[PDB]
Design a protein around this nucleic acid. Structure first.
Ligand SMILES: O=P(O)(O)O[C@H]1[C@H](OP(=O)(O)O)[C@@H](OP(=O)(O)O)[C@H](OP(=O)(O)O)[C@@H](OP(=O)(O)O)[C@H]1OP(=O)(O)O
Ligand SMILES: Nc1nc2c(ncn2[C@@H]2O[C@H](COP(=O)(O)OP(=O)(O)OP(=O)(O)O)[C@@H](O)[C@H]2O)c(=O)[nH]1
Ligand SMILES: [Mg+2]
Ligand SMILES: [Mg+2]
Ligand SMILES: [Mg+2]
Ligand SMILES: [Zn+2]
Lengths: 96, 96, 241, 22, 82, 81, 352
RNA sequence: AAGCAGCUUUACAGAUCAAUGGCGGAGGGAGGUCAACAUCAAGAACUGUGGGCCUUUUAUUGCCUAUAGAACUUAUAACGAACAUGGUUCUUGCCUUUUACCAGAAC
RNA sequence: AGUGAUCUAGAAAG
């Protein structure tokens, strides 16, 4: 089996890609329409909470995320979903 | 600190992880005739940014970089100070 | 943690590392050299624990006391702790004495404080025949240590010493195993425990004796108690074998 | 500097000998 | 309520209008208002007489709309959830 | 080891490994060429001003601008010489 | 690494070593981790931290000498005005000729002649063809324009002192003396190294200096610990504090200052340790400040220690000579004798 | 937000006291320093089940796709906010030999 | 003009 723990937490299996609360095909069906796409850059200083803001938007979009521990469901620790490189997990920092 | 065999005072000490030493090394690469000395590179730097300040960081682990600066005000007084108050440490807010 | 919580699970008393939070932090700068090196050595122990985890196995069904409890030969009751200690002292004395006597070494005498002494100057054939090994001696000295602890509790319960004297006595015993017990002679790796107890004594005293000055009275025996329990953890399989 | 738990000078809150009080 | 929200959730798709006057218009819904005013682009148009034409861009007053046809995809849009 | 000083380990050294910092520790010919260049710069400066005025505010033909621009230099070169 | 990290610059020296440029110490730590752990997966030696120097002028060239390999080129150098440096640093002025000449005449106060004679803006420098028409008609120099500009580009991409980039220089052509005989297509090849050499002579005649990039630093610290922060800014060489912001409604101050990049190694660690974690700082170079290093590069006999950091008056010489030895250019150092005739060099040395 | 109409109904009183459907009832709750069995470190790494699939008929497993439910553990990665011992090999230390040991590594 | 860096540790048999 290919393994990626040495570099990044990443979902290799399509069966484990999390289920959206919305129907995902419906989202693709409006990708044809330029007026319905907005591209948003979340920028800001060091430790402003940008990855945490994204964690809010990710959790509210999905039914169940396999990487959620009870420490994260209860809010003791941030999910840090987009900080998924091993190096980012170790530094506590968005790098890429 | 263990892996690099560097010890800040106050911290523990261990016998070296790699007890060999490259006594064969003679090359010009880090000759003092080529190095620009401006600040002495402390061991603290060698553990803060281990891959930058060490030539052979074998088996190091990446440190956590930073947390946002703590601003937890504590209520000193017994009774006369309520839970919410403008502590003397705080700068005022002159804008109007 | 744990004070930001309002619920939790119970932990074992030996699992509450009370003194640990002190040496994970920087010592007060005015402290003398022995205290500082004590801090440094305790940090060494902590770091080496964190490097090399010995994860447990899951198929560990046959715990001793549960397995014995299934038998007709073992029965339950409840007794006072001091009674349990006195019983265990009598039992261990009986065990080692019976082992001495089955081997025919009646010319050796075992004190009720678990010193082994010859009753007479021994022949060379007697010396060869009576040359007990490290298994017996380790067993004997552990019984001696337990005997000291139980005897302090007995002194308290007789009314001979009050509670503060008891606390100081337990603390003294756990710090001075190296002088009271001689257990290092048969297992020299216990010097790690003795050294850890000394380091703990240094940091505990220089937290405790601030603005008090010298003299006995420090009875905060919980860290050294943890040291010796965690030593017994790894000494059980060795002595069983 | 004084111990806020008992008012005496020098020693800190953590190093006080009088019991804590609210 | 949901029907005006569906007409807003229809913007950017091709819709077909029929009016009280009997005209019909089919085209890309550029904007729609809570009053059911709509703007269509690249509009196929049809007269009450059945005559057909084409026009670049139109606006229609809400009161005169008889019904609006919406792409079938929208039956599973998140609008209809409880 | 700390800051590159001290033993690999105190073990096996027969010492404590304690370390403490030691408190006991007339012009040349090529120079004249700038002076030559200045006098010929002056001519081109006035030519540039006149040519810019002709281009921007007086005429639309390149040949009309260029001849009137050259008229300035043709006189100024002898005016300085 | 060059693909994945957008801001990193990677180049290879003629020494056979690889040079990586990054934004700062954490950035380098990250990409070197990537090299060791994911991508190269080999053991890699690295130097102590350095900085990108650049070479510049402090006066006009004392003589506009001719330089030759029968073809000859002469150029002179002069510092750009600070206003134009600060504007062109931001890729702004105030490429159409009339518009550019208008704003050069207007905001930057240039002569109209030089204003129209601009021939390229390139990496914080400007080339001006003030060649007089008496020797070379405009048509004849126009035949060579692209390739002489290419030579000037070579010149500013690597300088005479240390093969570091030139910055902040006006280059002025005096003349390119072209043979009447030879076919121009071959002469294309000849003029680019001679224009490089001519620019080198022009800068070395212009009282050259070494320029050092300056980090701006934003420091957030608890207000009662400002004495420690300013003491640290005194301990580091060349660092200065310009403003203190009282962060309203908090115990914090925001302290804005500067420190040179060569002096910046381990700044964050020193500040965090001295303040016991009640202070933090950010180092950045989006305002592209370049500053003169103290001392003279051409000072042959300045004192440079073997191990201690050098004194102030010998810093520029120390940086230049260490860079030269590291690159393999070199104990004599840069001088015009490398490029100009011996009689001219000795005469210049005598005349001063 | 209450005054009125709809939903919910239940302490009730009815037509009904039939024919229906809805939700419960056809072996209760809280505890135990009780026991047994199952399971707990892995492609971020889960099982069942409907349809399609290479093993020459794809079986039960490995693959594609549809769908219901995932307890405990884990990202400054671990059941345990805690922390012992032993075996083998290698390299050290103390060292007259072995046990007992010095302290780093790997398994 | 002074910041710091602190190895050990004993018993048996032969
Ligand atoms: O050798 P140490 O581990 O350091 O401990 C030594 C004593 O232990 P013993 O040698 O067994 O008697 C101890 O008394 P005890 O623990 O027995 O009650 C003293 O504590 P205190 O007087 O009660 O405060 C120590 O005095 P301090 O120096 O102030 O810590 C003393 O240290 P010293 O040997 O350097 O003088
Ligand atoms: N007190 C408090 N802390 C927060 C809040 N949001 C995020 N944090 C903490 O701030 C730290 C930084 O979190 P991130 O989400 O990574 O912030 P970031 O903007 O993504 O920072 P970068 O990694 O540099 O991009 C973490 O320790 C968070 O727990 C907040 O709203 N309140
Ligand atoms: Mg982030
Ligand atoms: Mg022998
Ligand atoms: Mg013999
Ligand atoms: Zn007090």
């Amino acid at each position: 089996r290919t393994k990626l723990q040495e570099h990044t937490i990443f979902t290799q299996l399509k069966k484990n890609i999390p289920k959206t609360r919305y129907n995902r095909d419906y989202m693709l069906s409006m990708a044809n329409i330029p007026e319905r796409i907005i591209n948003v850059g979340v920028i800001g200083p060091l430790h402003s909470g940008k990855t945490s803001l994204m964690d809010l938007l990710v959790i509210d979009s999905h039914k169940r995320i396999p990487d959620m521990s009870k420490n994260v469901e209860l809010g003791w620790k941030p999910l840090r979903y987009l900080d998924n490189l091993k190096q980012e997990i170790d530094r506590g920092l968005s790098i890429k | 600190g263990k892996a690099l065999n560097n010890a800040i005072p106050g911290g523990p000490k261990f016998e070296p992880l790699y007890p060999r030493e490259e006594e064969e090394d003679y090359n010009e690469f880090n000759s003092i005739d080529r190095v620009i000395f401006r600040v002495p590179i402390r061991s603290e730097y060698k553990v803060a940014f281990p891959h930058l300040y060490n030539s052979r960081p074998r088996s190091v682990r990446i440190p956590w970089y930073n947390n946002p600066v703590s601003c937890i005000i504590q209520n000193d007084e017994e009774y006369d100070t309520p839970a919410l108050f403008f502590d003397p440490s705080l700068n005022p807010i002159p804008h109007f | 943690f744990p004070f930001n919580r309002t619920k939790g699970k119970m932990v074992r008393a030996q699992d509450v590392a009370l003194a640990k939070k002190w040496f994970l932090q920087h010592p007060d700068e005015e402290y003398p050299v022995k205290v500082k090196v004590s801090y440094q050595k305790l940090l060494k122990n902590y770091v080496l624990n964190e490097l090399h985890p010995t994860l447990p196995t899951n198929h560990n069904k046959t715990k001793l006391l549960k397995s014995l409890k299934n038998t007709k030969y073992f029965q339950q009751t409840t007794i006072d702790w001091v009674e349990a200690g006195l019983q265990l002292c009598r039992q261990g004395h009986n065990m080692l004495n019976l082992l001495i006597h089955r081997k025919g070494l009646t010319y050796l005498h075992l004190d009720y404080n678990f010193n082994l002494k010859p009753t007479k100057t021994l022949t060379t054939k007697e010396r060869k025949k009576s040359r007990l090994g490290n298994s017996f001696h380790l067993m004997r000295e552990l019984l001696k240590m337990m005997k000291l602890i139980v005897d302090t509790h007995v002194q308290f319960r007789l009314g001979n010493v009050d509670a503060f004297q008891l606390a100081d006595g337990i603390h003294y015993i756990l710090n001075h195993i190296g002088q009271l017990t001689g257990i290092y002679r048969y297992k020299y790796k216990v010097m790690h425990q003795i050294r850890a107890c000394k380091d703990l004594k240094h940091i505990i005293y220089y937290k405790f004796n601030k603005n008090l000055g010298k003299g006995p009275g420090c009875g905060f025996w919980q860290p050294a108690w943890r040291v010796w329990l965690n030593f017994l953890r790894g000494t059980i399989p060795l002595l069983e074998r | 500097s004084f111990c806020r738990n008992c008012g005496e000078a020098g020693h800190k809150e953590k190093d006080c000998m009088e019991k804590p009080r609210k | 309520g949901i029907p005006v929200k569906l007409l807003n959730e229809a913007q950017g798709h091709i819709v077909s209008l029929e009016l009280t006057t009997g005209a019909t218009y089919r085209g890309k819904l550029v904007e729609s208002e809570d009053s059911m005013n709509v703007q269509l682009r690249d509009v196929i148009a049809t007269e009450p007489q059945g005559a057909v034409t084409h026009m670049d861009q139109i606006f229609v007053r809400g009161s005169q709309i008889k019904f609006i046809v919406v792409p079938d995809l929208l039956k599973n849009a998140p609008l209809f959830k409880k | 080891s700390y800051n590159g000083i001290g033993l690999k380990s105190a073990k096996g050294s027969s010492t404590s490994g304690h370390v403490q910092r030691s408190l006991a520790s007339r012009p040349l010919a090529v120079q004249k060429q700038i002076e030559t260049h200045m006098e010929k710069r002056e001519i081109e400066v006035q030519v540039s001003e006149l040519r810019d005025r002709l281009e921007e505010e007086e005429t639309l033909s390149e040949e009309q601008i260029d001849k009137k621009c050259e008229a300035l230099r043709a006189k100024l070169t002898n005016e300085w010489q | 690494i060059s693909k994945y990290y957008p801001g990193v610059i990677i180049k290879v020296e003629e020494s056979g070593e690889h040079v990586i440029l990054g934004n700062g110490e954490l950035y380098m730590d990250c990409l070197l981790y990537d090299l060791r752990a994911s991508y190269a997966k080999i053991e890699i030696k690295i130097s102590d931290p350095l900085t990108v120097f650049s070479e510049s002028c402090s006066n006009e060239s004392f003589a506009s000498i001719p330089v030759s390999n029968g073809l000859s080129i002469s150029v002179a150098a002069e510092p750009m005005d600070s206003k134009m440096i600060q504007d062109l640093s931001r890729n702004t002025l105030g490429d159409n000729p009339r518009k550019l000449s208008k704003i050069l005449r207007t905001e930057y106060g240039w002569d109209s002649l030089a204003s129209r004679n601009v021939w390229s803006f390139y990496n914080g420098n400007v080339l001006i063809n003030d060649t007089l028409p008496d020797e070379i008609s405009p048509e004849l120099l126009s035949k060579y324009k692209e390739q002489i500009i290419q030579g000037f580009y070579w010149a500013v991409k690597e300088g005479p002192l240390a093969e570091e980039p030139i910055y902040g220089v006006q280059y002025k052509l005096l003349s390119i003396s072209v043979p009447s005989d030879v076919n121009i297509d071959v002469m294309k090849s000849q003029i680019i190294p001679l224009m490089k050499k001519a620019c080198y002579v022009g800068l070395l005649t212009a009282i050259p200096i070494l320029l050092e990039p300056i980090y701006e630093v934003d420091i957030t610290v608890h207000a009662p610990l400002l004495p420690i922060v300013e003491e640290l800014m005194k301990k580091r060489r060349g660092s200065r504090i310009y403003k203190t912001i009282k962060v309203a409604g908090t115990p914090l101050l925001e302290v804005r200052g500067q420190v040179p990049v060569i002096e910046s190694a381990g700044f964050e660690t020193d500040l965090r340790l001295s303040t016991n974690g009640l202070g933090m700082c950010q180092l950045y170079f989006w305002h592209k400040i370049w500053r003169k290093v103290p001392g003279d590069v051409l000072d042959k006999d300045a004192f440079i220690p073997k191990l201690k950091p050098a004194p102030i008056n010998s810093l520029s010489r120390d940086f230049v000579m260490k860079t030269r030895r590291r690159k393999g250019i070199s104990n004599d150092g840069p001088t015009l004798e490398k490029y100009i005739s011996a009689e001219l060099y000795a005469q210049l040395r005598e005349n001063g």
